[PDB]
Design a protein around this ligand. Structure first.
Ligand code: 3G8
Ligand code: 3G8
Ligand code: PLP
Ligand code: PLP
Ligand code: CL
Lengths: 429, 428
């Protein structure tokens, strides 16, 4: 198909994320190639190279078509594409499980593989519910979180997403009614944690778990909070016997400047989800980890098992690339890489603070955010960034980047320059 | 890792489908290769080649490592592994969506890609709920199904799975309470459809959709029902203004002897899900299709959009291997192949009817089932079949197979022989 044929088919037949059919303000841009930090996109019938400043939605940490990850895929392809995980096991699952339990916060000793972040969140919720049932406390079935969060799009996942951002108006009484604390502030405020505890105390007997994104809330608004809150959450959860679940689907694998965002606080959750960067952005794969105690309590309960088992559970191909992606990350000085990346974002985004439409500029590891005073118009922003050789996709009032770890200092400055120019335009109407 | 090392890591750290940690009666068997219809498994520490009678849980329709599918993946890998589907589109998505709209039952014009069957089911449910909100009828939010079904493991999907199979007993107070009709029978009985309609009619004002597996109910018990039931459901849903959703995640792509099981009935659902065999068993991918009416109504609704968007939506690699898989199926006489396989299954399973513990033997396309009168002991059944060069995984009282379409007559004879032998041992 030609780019124009692809556009025709797409407009008629393809749903996009959170999109309409037939009512799109802009056609999607055709992508024809991806290599390293660069995408080849079609603009006015001509191919252009632009930087993937979004890491293709947080996924492409090593960039596209990395030889180590390509080779990992083709090597696994040559022996075994997939077998069912019911009754069989294999080397890719075992290797990845071994790696994951070694590098995640201490105590996370078992691994349940699934195909997407949303599913891994539901698995985590199931683990928590079956846990309490194994303890003779089936009343403990609700979840608690803070506002501003995002945990995926399946119906249990939605129930703990920010109610305003996810227009929960659309749903309910179909959505489960969960417990929400106020938005967690950026700066540490002991009063917030005290009120969180007081709220939790009122519901402790009906709560299976607190579920939060640690340090960075992604799709809910690219907000950062002080890691000390996570220490408070751990303590509250321990004292009130509520499980603590960290959703690290966006934050995992070095993105915030630590291997996992929990590491900024030295905190171990009872249950943890990982996903987006797990395969280096090649294939869908997620994992839910839990402690030995959680696993043994579920296993000793009425069901005798965790009642979940996706078709492609522990897919050999996905597990193989993920093994290579994690090993590639661990085999280099990733911490220095991310620190340098953050310094580049900070230096490059500084001039945005003085722009009329800009409310905040914030950086946390390989995450750079310009917060504007109005919703960013994509019909203006997207082509403006493409004119500057960068793929940017703002959402709501945010012009942001989560660049691949392989971006050079020059590439980071090109990315931040484009973000600055988009923000300048936002203040021009 | 060596097989011995794999087993050790596995026992300590790996969950399996619906399994325990530390309480497994039998270790899982180490798989080390898969080629064509055969798996290489480790038995007594030695690699042995056995037939994948289960198609690796319905997925491996063209067998493992099919040169055309390996090549499709390898070719895409050199071009573009993945890009975000927010604000971008690409050739593998467009090619696959065109194929899928062309070959599915008439009227399914739009395609929402996701990464698994359970997600595609929740997407279908979301489409139904947003559709009726768009029509100014927000009370229409419940689902109706018949018993015996399986639709996946996410919490909404669980709410329409069979209450007994799904151990809803362990879920008291957490699942949505849905509307269940009695088990749909094998043989066509107009009284069943009339009762179904009467039950639906009294709930019509609160029902968004009927959701069923068409013709074959898989993980809920490998039960077949007369296609005419689906004709009746289409009629009932039309007349009572309730959307009809077929979950073809197990039945799709030729498995029941029609390209999609809805084709047996000559009926089109408003929303359809596909998944397991979509990529030919290479990679996780699923799709939810809906009519233009559903799509336009959602898009004119209050959200102005379907409120869903998975990270890996329309992944180029998965879409590329799916295109090759679907084209491979469509470019051969698949209909004859499935007919031959069904004949092979019928002939090979016939002697099992006489066996003392066997209550039923049934075949539908490339699906063969021996139903026994008691639970099949996996500790006995599985090494028994392995002894005979076949990988089989019974569940409950069922010894069954969904072999790859590439299985030769000799291979079907071998699978069926092993199945008969497992059923014999059950009677002991
Ligand atoms: C909810 C219905 N049940 C009964 C508890 C199911 C459903 C599906 C499976 C799938 C199983 C399985 O074999 C596989 C799941 C995914 C790849 S193979 C399994 O062992 O137990 C199940 C049990
Ligand atoms: C439920 C929160 N919302 C609604 C405001 C979200 C959440 C996530 C996305 C992701 C989007 C997206 O760009 C992508 C989704 C998957 C790959 S890219 C998007 O366009 O809109 C969203 C909207
Ligand atoms: C993206 C994301 C999810 C959902 O992952 P999918 O693969 O899109 O289903 C869940 N939680 C967090 C924190 C995320 O960033
Ligand atoms: C397997 C199956 C599902 C769920 O698919 P996963 O990919 O395992 O989540 C849904 N519906 C039917 C009919 C199935 O057979
Ligand atoms: Cl019809």
């Amino acid at each position: 198909l030609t780019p124009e044929q692809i556009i025709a088919v797409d407009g008629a037949h393809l749903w996009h994320p959170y999109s309409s059919i037939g009512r799109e303000a802009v056609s999607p841009v055709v992508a024809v190639a991806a290599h390293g930090a660069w995408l080849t996109l079609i603009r006015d019938g001509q191919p252009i190279e632009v930087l993937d400043a979004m890491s293709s939605w947080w996924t492409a940490i090593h960039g596209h078509g990395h030889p180590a990850l390509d080779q990992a895929l083709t090597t696994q392809l040559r022996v075994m594409n997939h077998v069912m995980f019911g009754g069989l096991t294999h080397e890719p699952a075992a290797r990845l499980a071994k790696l994951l339990v070694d590098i995640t916060p201490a105590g996370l000793d078992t691994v349940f593989f699934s195909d997407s972040g949303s599913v891994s969140v539901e698995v985590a919720a199931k683990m928590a519910l079956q846990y309490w049932r194994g303890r003779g406390l089936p009343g403990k079935r609700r979840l608690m979180t803070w506002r501003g969060g995002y945990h995926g799009d399946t119906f249990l996942a939605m129930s703990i997403c920010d109610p305003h951002g996810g227009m929960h108006s659309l749903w309910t009484d179909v959505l489960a009614a969960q417990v929400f604390a106020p938005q967690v502030p950026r700066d540490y405020d002991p009063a917030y944690s005290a009120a969180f505890e007081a709220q939790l105390a009122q519901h402790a007997g009906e709560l299976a778990a607190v579920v939060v994104e640690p340090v960075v809330q992604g799709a809910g608004g690219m907000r950062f909070h002080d890691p000390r809150y996570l220490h408070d959450l751990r303590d509250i959860c321990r004292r009130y016997e509520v499980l603590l679940i960290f959703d690290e689907i966006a934050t995992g694998f070095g993105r915030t400047g630590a291997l996992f965002a929990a590491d900024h606080a030295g905190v171990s959750p009872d249950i943890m989800c990982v996903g987006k960067a797990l395969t280096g952005g090649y294939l869908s794969l997620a994992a839910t980890l839990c402690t030995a105690d959680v696993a043994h309590t579920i296993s000793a309960g009425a069901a005798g098992a965790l009642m979940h088992g996706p078709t492609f559970m522990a897919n050999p191909l996905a597990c193989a690339v993920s093994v290579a992606s994690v090993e590639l990350l661990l085999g280099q000085d990733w911490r220095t890489r991310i620190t340098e990346l953050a310094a580049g974002l900070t230096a490059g985004l500084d001039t945005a603070r003085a722009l009329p439409a800009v409310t905040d500029v914030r950086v946390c590891g390989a995450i750079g955010v310009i917060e504007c005073d109005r919703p960013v118009d994509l019909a203006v922003a997207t082509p403006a960034a493409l004119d500057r050789g960068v793929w940017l996709r703002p959402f709501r009032n945010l012009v942001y980047a989560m660049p691949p770890y392989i971006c050079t200092p020059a590439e980071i400055t090109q990315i931040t320059s484009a973000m600055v120019e988009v923000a300048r335009l936002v203040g021009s109407l």
